[PDB]
Design a protein around this ligand. Structure first.
Ligand SMILES: Cc1cc(C(=O)O)c(C)n1C
Ligand SMILES: Cc1cc(C(=O)O)c(C)n1C
Ligand SMILES: Cc1cc(C(=O)O)c(C)n1C
Lengths: 281, 281, 281
């Protein structure tokens, strides 16, 4: 199924009939960082499998819902169960839910992920406000926009220089200062590693030479689809480890260690993003 | 449809019957840089859609013709409407028209494109004679030759060290000097960004560290198919902007600004390439 | 055909019935480096085409057998006719033979290849013990594990930091010292170029800046599938040329020159790997 205007419209029609909510804000949350979705007020939970033209996700399994309701007095829509390109989903499958958000009325998309630290100033448990990216799949002919352009959503050749909104970054930092956890908050450039292997020690050393601050396996495809159709983005990485230190010390990362960092910061990240949603212009 | 010997032969048969021209030279022109094709003498215009085994292009739309005739007393064949891999065309679709050129008798391929400047010596409106390339899709398993080898055209493992003919570069520079616009002409290494997003500010900074002089979204796939089957190549980039300066100053590029640079240099590029065609050994 | 547990099991069943050998060790040999396979004792030769669910290889042609028997008193299984991703094989086709090795009982995989030298200390005819890698296809969304995870074999997010076993590297070096050819043996980081074009002169210069010691078109996909399912790996490159010197001197490489280096070192490499097999813990 192509992520075109007609197909996204049919999905938006089903959603509008079922939910009654007109959202201004969309959220996509990283693994272990989804507790806020369970606190949406007057919620409506819509399984992906029920929505016309949504991608099939039963090979991977696990949760896959769209959730609509209110947070802090604002109308939002959340994806519960993210689609990652390392699972084998196509460009069209990743893009359709973001384009449905656009047709529903979304103007701002908030995104969190888990990532590895490259910059020597980053420690496990730190947050990074993403200010730009290096898209290795995109340089190598696997950009999320490869294919026919869908003109109703955006231009054939987009400019990504303002993909990460500067005023949203400033508001996120302001709130961290108000609650005295600004010592945990950095800014940086995100490298997209297609995955699903954690980058090797020698790949990490290469990324340090190339000016990357953090590395991960998500987020950049959604950012590019959002920028293409005029949705503003704030993206925040939670740092699981420092891959450069680990390479010097011959220490390994694993998914168990990653999820333990998620649990350590989940409640603070929930409080942070609730206040960001409440304060958005 | 595979770009094999039998399929390319059927297309060359149709063309020979219809056109009566036996070309020695092929040309592929960048966007806004196609005026020379409209001045081919005793022309024959052949829509792609009419030629057996040519790739289907109706999803993208816009012009798509093969044009044969004479320029400066030389027999040429031009592609009017380029195929780009960021549109979703396969390896086989890009390669077949070049292999048809080979069977028609082409020995030299002349190529122009629009590109972004990385080297700090490059300004908008400058020309770059391409002397080598960095093929990010090719390093990442999207090389145009991935697939079975077509032995009738070339070897399984080609060497690209002489892909950009040195004597053709010298002739192009000599002609610029004769007409006193050599101050506009540079040489450089071309990075292939699969596209269709313009490279991000942080991607541009990375390319500066890696020794790239210019970046664009075309040309390298055609160069590799030509080199594989023994066709000599001259490739010239027209510089739309300097991406490094733009990143320092937070200025954006867009397709409108690019086409305006094309119009500013179109007539000089037309005159230049007409003289190159006339003077080729 | 997916490289899943059921499909790999059906192939392992056929093999066990036909061969009677229970192998502990697997080998994959580079081009021109396959003489050891012809000396396996009490051999059983099984054409790929006869084995349920093995990938179809008739478009490329040439040899394709699985060979089981004894070397130095140890039970082994060899692939005679390698599958390379630049031929157009999918992730699933490359992975299935390695996962069949796992089900047959393989605990150690020994791999050889031909490669280009980047590090200035490397000459034609040298050997490199691979200690880590830079996986350009993997950074760019063509990792061999992209797709659903096959949980019976390994985890969704593998760590590759110990993919190249350190004690196996030490044993290989010890044997070189015993036979007084240690002056030929180096260690280094391997860059995976998807292929099939030899890297360009400017790509080689880029790899020198990025800390790569050698470059080639194979091996990393098999290493990653082996690491994912807990098989230890030793990988050795035979150096065909130094690509950096060749770029400075405008000298070309070609497949004929590569195979001549293979023939010069084939008998010593055969003797080396026979002793490694005999001595494995
Ligand atoms: C969470 C995570 C993702 C990655 C990546 O290579 O994409 C790494 C090293 N970590 C720790
Ligand atoms: C014309 C053009 C192409 C590209 C590219 O990233 O491929 C850029 C930055 N410009 C200006
Ligand atoms: C044997 C070989 C492979 C490669 C590669 O680019 O992958 C090179 C340069 N050589 C010499």
């Amino acid at each position: 199924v192509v992520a075109n205007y007609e197909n996204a419209s049919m999905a938006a029609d089903y959603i509008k009939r079922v939910s009654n909510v007109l959202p201004d804000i969309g959220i996509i949350c990283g693994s272990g960082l989804g507790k806020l979705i369970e606190e949406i007020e007057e919620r409506k939970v819509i399984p992906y499998i029920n929505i016309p033209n949504f991608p099939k996700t039963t090979v991977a399994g696990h949760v896959g819902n769209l959730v609509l309701g209110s947070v802090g007095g604002r109308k939002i829509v959340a994806m519960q169960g993210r689609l990652h390109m390392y699972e084998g989903y196509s460009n069209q499958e990743i893009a359709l839910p973001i384009r449905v958000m656009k047709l529903l009325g979304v103007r701002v998309l908030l995104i969190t992920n888990l990532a590895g630290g490259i910059n020597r100033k980053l420690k496990s448990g730190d947050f990074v406000l993403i200010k730009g990216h290096i898209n290795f799949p995109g340089l190598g002919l696997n950009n999320v926009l490869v294919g026919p352009n869908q003109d109703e959503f955006g231009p054939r050749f987009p400019d990504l220089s303002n993909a990460y909104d500067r005023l949203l970054q400033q508001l996120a930092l302001k709130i961290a200062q108000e609650n005295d956890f600004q010592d945990l908050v950095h800014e940086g450039v995100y490298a997209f590693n297609g995955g699903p292997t954690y980058e090797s020690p020698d790949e990490s050393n290469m990324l340090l030479k190339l000016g990357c601050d953090v590395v991960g396996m998500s987020t950049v495809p959604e950012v590019i689809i959002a920028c293409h159709c005029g949705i503003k983005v704030l993206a925040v990485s939670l740092i699981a480890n420092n891959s450069i230190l680990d390479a010097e010390n011959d220490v390994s990362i694993n998914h168990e260690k990653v999820l333990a960092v998620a649990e350590k910061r989940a409640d603070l990240l929930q409080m942070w993003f609730k206040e960001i949603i409440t304060r958005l212009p």
